[PDB]
Amino acid sequence: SLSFTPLHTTSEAFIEKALPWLEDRYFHIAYLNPNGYTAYPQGAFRHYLAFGSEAAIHVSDATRVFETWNEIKKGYTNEWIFVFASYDGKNSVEQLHTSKEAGIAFAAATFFIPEHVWEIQPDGILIHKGSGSSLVTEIQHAQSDIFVKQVVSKESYFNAFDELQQIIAQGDAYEINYCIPFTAKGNISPAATYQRLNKKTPMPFSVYYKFNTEYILSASPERFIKKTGDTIISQPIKGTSEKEQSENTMIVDLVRNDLSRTAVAGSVCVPELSGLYTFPNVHQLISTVQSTIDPACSSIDVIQQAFPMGSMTGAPKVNVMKFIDRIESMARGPFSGTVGYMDPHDNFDFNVLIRSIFYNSATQELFMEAGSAITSYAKAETEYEECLLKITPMIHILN
Incomplete structure (x- = not known):
C-alpha cells in the first residue's frame, strides 16, 4: 500500500508553500503540473513532485546523453528516474555537431x-x-x-x-x-x-525544475512523447488556414517516421488529426500520433530515435538539423529539449521545452527562445512578428 496525506488547503495553496520550502532544502526538484487540463487527449502531465536524490548525474558532453540514460536505467530498474535532455542531445542520436556558443551555462x-x-x-x-x-x-x-x-x-x-x-x-x-x-x-x-x-499562462505540460544551480520554469503546452504500457504517443500542436493545415500534416508525417523506427510494423497511426479541445484559458488543435513499441526496442530507444522532436526541427530531419545549426545564432541548449519521468513500470512522459525561462543562479544568466515553422507559405514580416509575440509573455513576467 501507498500512504496518502489529506490536504486542508487547495493543492495550489500547498504547492505555493512547497516549492520555495523545497528550494531552500534540496538541490534536485522536479514539479510537473497539468494545471487542471483534465480533458487533454490521453491526459495532461501526471501531477508529480519529486525531490531529493539517491543518485544524480550531470552530463556536459552532448554526445553522451543516451549512453548515460541507458547506464542509469540499467542500474535502476523498477525505479523512478527524472530526466532533462537538452536539444544538443541530437549529437547523441546522429553524427551532428553544435557549432555555436550556448546562451546559458547548462x-x-x-x-x-x-x-x-x-x-x-x-x-x-x-x-x-x-x-x-x-x-x-x-x-x-x-x-x-x-x-x-x-x-x-x-x-x-x-x-x-x-x-x-x-x-x-x-x-x-x-x-x-x-x-x-x-x-x-x-x-x-x-x-x-x-x-x-x-x-499568467497555465498550460498542460508546465514544469518547475531545479538541478544544482540550473532551473527550468516552463509553461509548455506540448507533449513530446509518452509510453503507457506498450503504447507510444506523440502530440504535435497547431484554424482552417491552408498554411496551418499543410504545415501540421508535414510535421505529423515526420513524427510518424520517428515512431516507426521503434514500432511494431503496421502499428503507426494517427488516431486524431487536429482535434479541437476547449480548456478554460485556451482552445487548442492537437494531433495524436501513436505506435506500439517493438519488443526488441527499449523505452530509451523509442525516445532516442524520436529525439529531438519533429515539431521543432523539420524535413528532411538530419539535413535540416545541420541547416538549423549553421543558420541559428546560438546553440539551443535547453530550449527545445525535454523534461519528464520514467516510472517503475517502464512508463514515461516527456514535454517540449518551449514557452520556458532557463536560469542559472551561479552565472546569473537567463535564456529563452521562440520560433516558428518556415515553409514556402511563410512571409518574413509575419514570422518575425510571431517570434516576438511568442516570447513577449516570458519577458513580461520577468518585469
Whole structure:
C-alpha cells in the first residue's frame, strides 16, 4: 500500500508553500503540473513532485546523453528516474555537431533517482516513494526587474529567413523550425517566478525544475512523447488556414517516421488529426500520433530515435538539423529539449521545452527562445512578428 496525506488547503495553496520550502532544502526538484487540463487527449502531465536524490548525474558532453540514460536505467530498474535532455542531445542520436556558443551555462542532460515522489491530488498527497509524510506536515505548517536582450536583429532575422527560403526553393528542405534567442543577466527567485509565469499562462505540460544551480520554469503546452504500457504517443500542436493545415500534416508525417523506427510494423497511426479541445484559458488543435513499441526496442530507444522532436526541427530531419545549426545564432541548449519521468513500470512522459525561462543562479544568466515553422507559405514580416509575440509573455513576467 501507498500512504496518502489529506490536504486542508487547495493543492495550489500547498504547492505555493512547497516549492520555495523545497528550494531552500534540496538541490534536485522536479514539479510537473497539468494545471487542471483534465480533458487533454490521453491526459495532461501526471501531477508529480519529486525531490531529493539517491543518485544524480550531470552530463556536459552532448554526445553522451543516451549512453548515460541507458547506464542509469540499467542500474535502476523498477525505479523512478527524472530526466532533462537538452536539444544538443541530437549529437547523441546522429553524427551532428553544435557549432555555436550556448546562451546559458547548462547541462547537456541531467538524471536523478528521487528520494521522494509525490502525486498531488485535489484533496491530498499520494506518496509513491520515500517516507515523507512528516515533510508534507512541515510544509503545511511552514526582486529587481530584468531587461531582456534580443540577440537576433530584424535585419539578421530576414537574412536567415532568406537563407532558409533559398534552401527550400532549391529543394533541399520543405519545412524548418527557425528559432531566435533572448538573453538576460540578473537574479531571480525561481519558484516565485514560476508561480507568476504559471498563473499568467497555465498550460498542460508546465514544469518547475531545479538541478544544482540550473532551473527550468516552463509553461509548455506540448507533449513530446509518452509510453503507457506498450503504447507510444506523440502530440504535435497547431484554424482552417491552408498554411496551418499543410504545415501540421508535414510535421505529423515526420513524427510518424520517428515512431516507426521503434514500432511494431503496421502499428503507426494517427488516431486524431487536429482535434479541437476547449480548456478554460485556451482552445487548442492537437494531433495524436501513436505506435506500439517493438519488443526488441527499449523505452530509451523509442525516445532516442524520436529525439529531438519533429515539431521543432523539420524535413528532411538530419539535413535540416545541420541547416538549423549553421543558420541559428546560438546553440539551443535547453530550449527545445525535454523534461519528464520514467516510472517503475517502464512508463514515461516527456514535454517540449518551449514557452520556458532557463536560469542559472551561479552565472546569473537567463535564456529563452521562440520560433516558428518556415515553409514556402511563410512571409518574413509575419514570422518575425510571431517570434516576438511568442516570447513577449516570458519577458513580461520577468518585469
